[PDB]
């Protein structure tokens, strides 16, 4: 099959050089001098692409385009004209032109547009497949060399890059290679954390930015600037990948000023991590200073019901007299309400919004076959997340903030991992446990006998902490088989994994 | 805000004309003579677009691109160079370049590329809105003119066209006009059906559920040229199809598309069974009491489709090797993907995929699905996500390799019910806004909700309204439900 081109121009007899060029390139060009002939050609015959002049005696190119797009919206249409008017350019771009070439045109420029608009998807597939084949060995090498949290952040960035690049690939072999590297990554990372996590709490020992540090170190800078109002959003349970899946969407509204990967504290759970962000204190300290607000695992009810109170305290503790408000979105109506009334929040210097949909979506796979099919693999989960955010009430809140000229700070508390392998436990989050009579496979988990060392509560001195590594889910020995069937291939958090601990901090200035 | 350009070229002084031109158009341009310095500027500051020469002393533009894209993948990158080599063009397009301008370049070509890659969304919003503003009155007029089923089929195509076009627009006025026309459409359509559905069963009627297999499918098999994959997606609206038609194109070329009218009530029990049997519910009950089930009966109503289908093949006097599969879950669909290989020698493969129906009513209950499918746009977006990553696509991807012709259809669609009707929420079977059929015999079988109505029992009216308001329901008369797609595709 040769590519069939329909070229419409009043002076088409003058462009025969170009036609002869495309001819040798095995491109078949049918010509027309009027739009009406072209529509007739377009309706009768099945073309792959269409070239149109704008200034044509009779129907204009744009008029002809509109008619044709009504009939066959899939066919790419390129404009080749002498018109240099900015306004004509804009009308055609808005008419969803595939390219606009100003005459006189280099024949190879038309070839560029033909390749770009007809073979791009294949070229990307080909390039991606080849470029990875020349990188995966190097990826393996780098992973075995990793020795720092900064090196872990860089390698995660690389892994994420290739993950989303290989979702436009067909070669399963390369995908299995990448999955293998991601597995080895978590394996090595968990050992790294198992070896370094405690020492990070030694005074002055070089530690990354963590949950309890986030506000004072990263947000408080932005507020001191006193240049703009700030919307500080916390999307619960957002994996780095998921952010990357909707980064282009956010771009349509917000320019990224700053991105800092930061490490969630253990356990990587809402109860501990999020409260830490809002308090600027570690869970243990929150237990000490705010027993009225803190809630241990044993305690019933919500565990993050007093985030606003912790936060207001931190702002007061940091001696900032500012206007601040706090919203915790837990459902559609709540988010839609806040979106339609965000206007009222103009006066505030700071607006903090907590959003919980993705955590809810993540856990839904455990309970819904619908979400099972919609989030079969990470790619699917990314695609599902993108569908959400593109139609999310949160985006309406973000769009509203942009209109009000608010600076946007997007962050999370932790991520989630698709657990695949069961680990037996006797004595929750299925990735972390605390208690006295704890039985565990120690090769499978990171044990902290003295929790107060890692800034965690300890009901008793006996009490300790266990954190599942890699893709392990802690399964109680009672009803082991049932635990395994129900939680296998489900998103669980609270443990140590790249997906869970390394999460994004993002600052955006309004466009 | 001025747009910041990062332009890298070895001969960046030879490009002073261009830079001056851009600058006058309020474009801020930062220049560099080498990729390495450019990479540094790319990281240190936040630019909006980057221009790159290929042939450069030092790192090539493509090398500089790769390094930059790893550091900030969002930023659009344009290549401006003399290289005419097909391979360099190909590498840039494989490298996800936004545009590639061959030197010497017209300064306006650069400007077009700047606008095209940075302001297109806004321009398209403006153009789309204005195009509709000047077309909606014509659309209303055609709607006031429609008086045939072919007329209805065409206006539906028009409405669907504008639906997908205006989904991203901001002008609420125009959005509400489209909704008005959509409402009026089903209103007038329901009257059309109410006034012609009965007569259609008297010896000009459209293709319907009881006629689909013999009138459309049977011919395509008589050709005896290729093996056939006959997929029935339960509860698939035309808009949903349109949302993933791009994806299907990457694998299957559309040979034929025929809108047909689902039989009333638009429910799998009655409609999908007819598709496989070629009989109306009344006749289905008479000929196969062994296989038919009424509303009063217990259990699944479409376990006998394979038997009905085999029967229809026999009743049509054809003998071919046939199989029937009903996918109802992820495992089931992912299973059939690998084993689809084996069944190639068998002539026809029928796959029933019921995931879409499941998704529709999930919104009725789960807050997750409520956010994922709050509006039609979101529902279409959700369908596109699904299909792109579905075992069904793998089934289709298998068939093309096996050189199967694909026939894709549904049994009915679903509509966002919003208004309650005091008394499945779109059809009922005993006497208690609506299409009344005193004799089920005449229509080969009742009440029929029209116009986004949900039938609510009077005993628990309030609760039915609160729970089933703004939920996808099927079984009644609406364009969204009755006018459904029949597609035949030859493998690519
Ligand atoms: Ca002309
Ligand atoms: Ca959770
Ligand atoms: Ca050069
Ligand atoms: Ca249903």
Author numbering:
A (entry chain B): 2 to 428, 434 to 517
B (entry chain A): 2 to 204, 207 to 426, 435 to 443, 450 to 462, 471 to 517
Which lines from the publication concern this structure?
Additional support to the link between metal coordination and residues 358–369 conformation is provided by the T271V APS catalytically inactive mutant structure. In the T271V structure, a density corresponding to a divalent cation could only be observed in Zn1 site (coordinated by Asp360, His364, and His499) and not in the Zn2 site (coordinated by Thr271, Asp237, Asp414, and His415), while residues 358–369 of both monomers adopted a helical conformation instead of the helical-extended coil dyad observed in the same primitive orthorhombic crystal form of the wild type. Moreover, ICP-MS measurements revealed that the T271V mutant had a reduced ability to bind zinc with only 1.22 ions per monomer, instead of two seen by the wild type. Using the REC domain's phosphorylation-null mutant (D54A), the APS domain's catalytically inactive mutant (T271V) and their double mutant (D54A/T271V), we confirmed that these residues can specifically undergo phosphorylation in PorXFJ. Mutating the catalytic residues T271V, the metal-coordinating residues D360A/H364A, and the APS dimerization interface residues S384A/S388E, abolished the observed phosphodiesterase activity against bis-pNPP. For example, the catalytically inactive T271V variant exhibited a mixed population of both monomers and dimers, while the zinc coordination D360A/H364A double mutant remained mostly monomeric upon incubation with zinc. However, our attempts to co-crystalize the catalytically inactive T271V variant of PorXFJ with pGpG did not reveal the corresponding density in the APS catalytic site.
